[PDB]
Structure 1
Amino acid sequence: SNMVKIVTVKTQAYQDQKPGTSGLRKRVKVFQSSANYAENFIQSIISTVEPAQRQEATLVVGGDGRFYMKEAIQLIARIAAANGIGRLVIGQNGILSTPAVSCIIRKIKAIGGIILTASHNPGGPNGDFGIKFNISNGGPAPEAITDKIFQISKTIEEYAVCPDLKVDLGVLGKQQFDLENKFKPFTVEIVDSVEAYATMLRSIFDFSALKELLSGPNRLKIRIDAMHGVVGPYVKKILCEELGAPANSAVNCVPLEDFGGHHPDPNLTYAADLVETMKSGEHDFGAAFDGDGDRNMILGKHGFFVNPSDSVAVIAANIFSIPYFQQTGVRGFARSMPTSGALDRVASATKIALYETPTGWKFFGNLMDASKLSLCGEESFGTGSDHIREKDGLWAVLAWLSILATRKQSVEDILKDHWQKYGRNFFTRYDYEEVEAEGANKMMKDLEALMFDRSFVGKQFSANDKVYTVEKADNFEYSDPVDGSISRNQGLRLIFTDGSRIVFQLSGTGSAGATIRLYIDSYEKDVAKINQDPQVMLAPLISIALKVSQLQERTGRTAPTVIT
């Protein structure tokens, strides 16, 4: 029935529904086995909306397809309706990529959106589930709002719900629900999952150029792996149906509730199938996305790996191959501090501002909203532009395809030319996982004290054959030029006179300990060095980093858990 009663349900608050910067993430079993866990959190989000503004408000709702998503969406509809939210816009089958949500919020001027995703984390009956809140600029809810949600969730005693309301998520169009003893209806609009996002890309890129690139016998041959996650139908409808790439181009492009039993996390080992396909030499270009579509990995012929720090620098260096930037101009470049300095070389040469921010969306969003930021990158497979207010993996792929079309060179030849022009920033990230937090903190504090001494700047480190000289050493701090906030203790930086850096970060302590992240950025300009093996060229600075930090002595680790 489309005539439904509003009911108040007494509930018991939980104490741990703290939404963080990427949403509340708990095991699926937690959501299923804890009474009113989901309901409490959804009500807490909706209670941040002024009652007077609810009727004219729209919330965009969708997710990455993982197990439990549709049940969660039904809960959101039932609770939003009962709370006087006038309208929901929901992707068909509940499916919306995180970039598509950002796109739709900004296009229709919604007050925000609720995204059902835990991004790269596994899904399924034994997997993870996540609930993310975005606000009216299409971006993540900032700390002041997530703080309020948390506060509400810890003392909630009741929520409002229409228990009999049920949305058909499979059929396009407007469904209206008349609420008992409420004058105005509740409206749900089911939209095609891809349409608005594709229409946005169709304006950003030259689809005629891309169709020519991707179709015919002389076509660029691509393999695009959605990793069984949300971007699948976007690949099929945009790259295959509209742009004419053959259907076999679309890899793992049917969304699965368990992401096929694997982590939808794009890197060389979680996307090993794509890497092996690329190794055969048949395809010119490959790419992988994470579960909600805001991260991307870029591959060339034979499985040549474009590391994400280089990827954003290449896009910057060929940015006017993309029609969007021909019209906006380039307002600025940015990277998170641990990302390699490759982008900086391009920005310096082209005389464009480079903003080096702490890790976190808010810093990019602030600069984009100031019209100071066109292109951003993170070493963790993140690339974006100010076209929306989330990173966007498929966008980054179409950027690469636009560049390939104008340059008429292989991926690898473009990188080789880039390194020859700008020098090469060899780059790796070492993750030491589940380390004992007390020894790891001791490592960091002892190293910070070493770096703070007056004599540390100017110290020399040898390989030997080569001398690295400390130019600067600190614990990174950032004063945000838009919101005035000061972010402190954002990472230990060893900055060397030759353009190289070592960066140490220590994560928060989880149930199994903390993660030490060690970033090595070694700059080389010599033609005899820029095409050598990266782990060989990085080995001297890796040795210096392990020696100065005494990491093995403090943690007992002789090797990182993961190398990227």
Structure 2
Amino acid sequence: NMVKIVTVKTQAYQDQKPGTSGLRKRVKVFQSSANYAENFIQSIISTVEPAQRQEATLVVGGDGRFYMKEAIQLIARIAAANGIGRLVIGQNGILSTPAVSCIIRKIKAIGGIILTASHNPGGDFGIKFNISNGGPAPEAITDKIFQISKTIEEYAVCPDLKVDLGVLGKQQFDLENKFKPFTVEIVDSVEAYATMLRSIFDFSALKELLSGPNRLKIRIDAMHGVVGPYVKKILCEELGAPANSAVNCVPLEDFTYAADLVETMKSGEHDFGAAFDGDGDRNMILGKHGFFVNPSDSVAVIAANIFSIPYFQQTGVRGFARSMPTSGALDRVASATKIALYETPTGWKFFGNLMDASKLSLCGEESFGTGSDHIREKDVLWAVLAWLSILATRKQSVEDILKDHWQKYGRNFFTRYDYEEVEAEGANKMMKDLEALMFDRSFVGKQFSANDKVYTVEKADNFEYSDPVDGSISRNQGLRLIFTDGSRIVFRLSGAGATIRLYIDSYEKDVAKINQDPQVMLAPLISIALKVSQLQERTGRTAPTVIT
């Protein structure tokens, strides 16, 4: 049954520049701008030179939420008309971002499209393009996508073509005036991903950890996002944790905090807790009674126990890496090995480039946690299994693992202050001023005291990074005050109003102070950061918006 191909005239929009995250615009502008979605999808596909489209395949994958199934049908209706040979789509459109990265690299696909949406899109909607390496397309190619979208006059579509996203296996489509049929492979949303995880961790050890009378009781709150089905399938059905272990594991099409987990952990039944947000980005790891594990500490605890995981035990640790605002806990375990450590600007794309050069195995970001080279994307579920592998071999509580880690390496106390929606004029004043402060001659070596704790400036710069892989240079990535005792203050702005991020990292070696409230131990450096920055006078803010 021959499906028509038609060319559709269009007006070009001028604000479809994607960046590190994809295109993310409000849903209302998608519904109220004609051909917004199509121009962009067409612009993505137009980066694929036409002679390489039949032997190419795209992995397309969705959030679960409202609008996704229609945007998948559209991608198909456009990719077919342009002669892309094959789409791989997860059943019902469900494909988490680690899953898309995974499949892209397993089947050697040309790239992928990842759809995303906000909790309650009454609310926005994202379209992100990944490339053959399974990671987000780099600036070189996002600039080409924008260039095309700005001068696009027409796109191609099969307006008659419809795909049954909930039926597994291959479907084929005969397009008029084409010889090869257009193919769509509907794949189990979880299968490929769980096969990868089964090759990385010891599912035998984990099954013995979560079943039995001496088992380890866990609660994983997936907060109604895409990782849900991966948690239920991998952690309950395969590994054997009781069904009540995984919570909120069905993605909801419509409708923010983490306190449900904190309350239930305070009860005392469970030994290990983890909560994710809707996006699958920001996330939390708790121990018994609510013991908090700092994301910067997980990176380090995992690094120091990294061979409890068969993957690294068998592949090696080719390198360690850390985003510049992330705490220096990782630095202390790396410095006891001959593994190099890299300090990258904020951005997972920077880890990806060292991974591609075979020079990075384990990495961490304060705002997310720990990742590896197994994919080119962040994986919360990976990070949860890494922690459970370590509980299984250490046979100790989360709290006792952290305590013995600090006992050996010392403790990096760490917090981040977010000031949101700040008067942008004053924000840039605050940092331009602060910069000139630290570039002054006598500034290095100046001393600061607060409550008989003395800090003296060892180095003060505005972090720059030369990517050793793509050659690019990234300036003004945040201002770092580094002190001789190994403590740090870092300041960043970020793009809706302005947003200030203030990171504080104090190193304590004294054992009588290891086990202390981080907000108390950090109070001296907080005070120093706010005097120097003059943050209250440039912003009016007397408290951060969030403390983390």
Q: TM-score range by the shorter chain?
A: over 0.9
* 1:21-43 Cα distance to aligned partner (Å, 9 max, x none): 01111122221221111111100
Provide, for residues 159-180 of structure 1, a one-character-per-residue CA deviation record: whole Å limited to 9, x for no partner: 1000110110111010101101
Whole-angstrom distance in 1 between the partners of 2:192 and 2:92: 16
Given candidates 184, 190, 209, the residue that maps to 1:188 is: 184
SS in 1 for 2:300: helix
Change in CA separation of 1:213 and 1:101 when aligned onto 2, cut-off 3 Å: same
Residue 373 of structure 2 is matched in structure 1 by 386
User: Following TM superposition, by how much is the alpha carbon of 1:225 offset from its aligned partner in structure 2, in angstroms?
Assistant: 0.9
> Does 2:83 correspond to 1:84?
yes
Separation in 1 of the partners of 2:149 and 2:125? 18
2:245 alignment partner in structure 1 = 249
Is contact 1:295-1:392 (8 Å) kept?
no
CA contact (8 A) 1:66 1:123 kept: no
Q: Does the aligned pair in 1 maintain the 2:287–2:398 contact within 8 Å?
A: yes
Moved more, 488-497 or 356-365: 356-365
Q: Match of 2:285, SS?
A: strand
Q: CA deviation at 1:121?
A: 9.0
The 10-residue stretch of structure 1 (454-463 or 110-119) with the greater mean CA deviation from structure 2: 110-119
Q: Per the alignment, in what secondary structure is the counterpart of residue 306 of structure 1? A: coil
Asked if 2 retains the 8 angstrom alpha-carbon contact of 1:294 and 1:382, the reply is no
- Determine the C-alpha separation between the residues in 2 that align with 1:162 and 1:50: 20
- Given that 1:88 and 1:189 are in contact with CA atoms closer than 8 Å, whether structure 2 keeps it comes out as yes
CA distance in 1, matches of 2:41, 2:114: 11
Is residue 289–residue 394 contact of structure 1 (8 Å, CA) maintained in 2? no
**3-state DSSP of counterpart to 2:40:** helix
CA distance in 2, matches of 1:175, 1:88: 10
Query: 1:542 aligns to what SS in structure 2?
Result: helix
Whole-Å Cα distance in 2 between the matches of residues 76 and 112 of structure 1? Answer: 13
Question: Does residue 5 in structure 1 map to residue 1 in structure 2?
Answer: no
Q: For structure 1, which runs of at least 5 residues remain unmatched after alignment? A: 260-268
Partners of 2:27 and 2:121 within 8 A in 1: no
CA contact (8 A) 1:99 1:294 kept: no
Q: CA deviation at 1:404?
A: 0.2
Mapped contact 2:23–2:126 kept (Cα < 8 A): yes
Secondary structure, aligned partner of 2:281: coil
**Alignment correspondent of 2:342:** 355
More displaced, 453-462 or 150-159?
150-159
Q: Secondary structure at the match of 2:117?
A: coil
1:364 positional shift: 0.6
1:123–1:257: 8 Å Cα contact kept in structure 2? no
* 1:111 shift after superposition: 0.4
1:293 is displaced (CA, Å) by 3.5
Q: 1:465 to 1:120 in 2, by over 3 A?
A: farther
Q: Is the 8 A contact 2:320 2:360 kept in 1?
A: yes
1:106-140 Cα distance to aligned partner (Å, 9 max, x none): 0000000000014789787xxx1100100000001
Gap regions ≥5 residues in structure 2: none
SS at match of 2:346: coil
Q: Do the aligned partners of 1:60 and 1:113 also contact (CA within 8 Å) in 2?
A: yes
Partner Cα separation in structure 1 for residue 82 and residue 369 of structure 2: 36
- Report the equivalent of 2:234: 238
Identity of aligned residues (%): 99
Kindly state the Cα deviation for residue 350 of structure 1 after the two structures are TM-superposed: 2.1
CA contact (8 A) 1:87 1:186 kept: yes
Q: 1:298 to 1:123 in 2, by over 3 A?
A: farther
Aligned CA distance change for structure 1 residues 383 and 553 (closer, same or farther; 3 Å)? same
After superposition, give the CA deviation of every residue in 1:377-428 in whole Å (9 maximum; x if it has no partner). Answer: 1000232100011011100001000000000111111111111111111111
- Cα distance in 2 between the residues matched to 1:401 and 1:450: 46
After TM superposition, give the deviation of residue 467 of structure 1 in Å: 0.6
Structure 1 residue 20: deviation in Å? Answer: 1.2
CA distance in 2, matches of 1:184, 1:123: 41
* 1:270-323 residue CA offsets vs partner (Å, 9 max, x unmatched): 111111111111000111223343554211111111110001100001000000
2:194 & 2:86 partners in 1: Cα distance? 23
Q: TM-score, normalised by structure 2?
A: 0.98
The 3-state SS of whatever aligns with 1:515 is: strand
Aligned to 2:501: 517
Do the aligned residues in 2 keep the contact of 1:433 with 1:561 (CA within 8 Å)? yes
Report the Cα distance in structure 1 between the residues aligned to 2:213 and 2:313, rounded to whole angstroms.
30
What residue is the counterpart of 2:450 in the other structure? Answer: 463
Q: Secondary structure at the match of 1:346?
A: helix
CA contact (8 A) 1:471 1:496 kept: yes
Is the CA contact (8 Å cut-off) linking 1:94 and 1:169 kept in structure 2? yes
**1:303 & 1:32 partners in 2: Cα distance?**
43
Question: What is the Cα deviation at residue 538 of structure 1?
Answer: 0.6
User: Which deviates more, 296-305 or 515-524?
Assistant: 296-305
Separation of aligned partners in 1, 2:500 and 2:482:
19
Q: Is the 8 A contact 2:345 2:477 kept in 1?
A: yes
Aligned 8 A contact 1:347 1:353 in 2 = yes
> Could you say if the C-alpha distance between residues 122 and 377 of structure 1 is closer, same or farther in structure 2, counting changes exceeding 3 Å?
farther
Specify the SS of the correspondent of 1:403: helix
Structure 1 residues 363 and 120: alpha-carbon distance in aligned structure 2, compared to 1, 3 A threshold: farther
Return the alpha-carbon distance in structure 1 between the equivalents of residues 227 and 353 of structure 2. Answer: 27
Question: Residue 401 of structure 1 aligns with which residue?
Answer: 388
Is 1:553 equivalent to 2:540 in the alignment? Answer: no
Which stretch shifts more, 22-31 or 211-220? 22-31
The CA deviation at 1:192 is: 0.2
SS in 2 for 1:302: helix
Q: Is the 8 A contact 1:28 1:68 kept in 2?
A: no
Please, which moves more after superposition, 114-123 or 366-375?
A: 114-123
Q: Is the 8 A contact 1:98 1:292 kept in 2?
A: no
Q: 2:118 touches 2:125 (CA, 8 Å); kept in 1?
A: no
Q: 1:295 to 1:174 in 2, by over 3 A?
A: farther
CA-to-aligned-CA distance 1:501-539 (integer Å, 9 cap, x gap): 0000011364xxx00100000110101111011100110
Deviation of 1:464 after TM superposition, in Å, equals: 2.7
CA shift at 1:362, angstroms?
Answer: 2.2
Encode CA deviations 1:254-273: one digit per residue, 9 max, x unaligned.
011126xxxxxxxxx71111
Partner of 1:66: 65
CA distance in 2, matches of 1:122, 1:272: 23
SS in 1 for 2:41: helix
Alpha-carbon deviations, 1:58-90, whole Å to 9, x = none? 000011112111111111000000000000000
- Of the structure 1 ranges 382-391 and 318-327, higher mean CA displacement relative to structure 2 is found in 382-391
TM-superposed deviation, 1:338: 0.4
SS in structure 1 of the partner of residue 11 of structure 2: coil
Shift of 1:351: 2.7
Cα distance, 1:142–1:273 mapped onto 2, change above 3 Å: same
Contact 1:60 1:89 in 2 (8 A): yes
User: Secondary structure in 2 aligned to 1:77?
Assistant: helix
Distance 2:369 2:155 in 1: 37
Number of equivalenced pairs? 548
Note if contact 1:103-1:388 (Cα within 8 Å) is conserved in structure 2. yes
Name which of structure 1's ranges 242-251 and 349-358 shifts more when overlaid on structure 2: 349-358
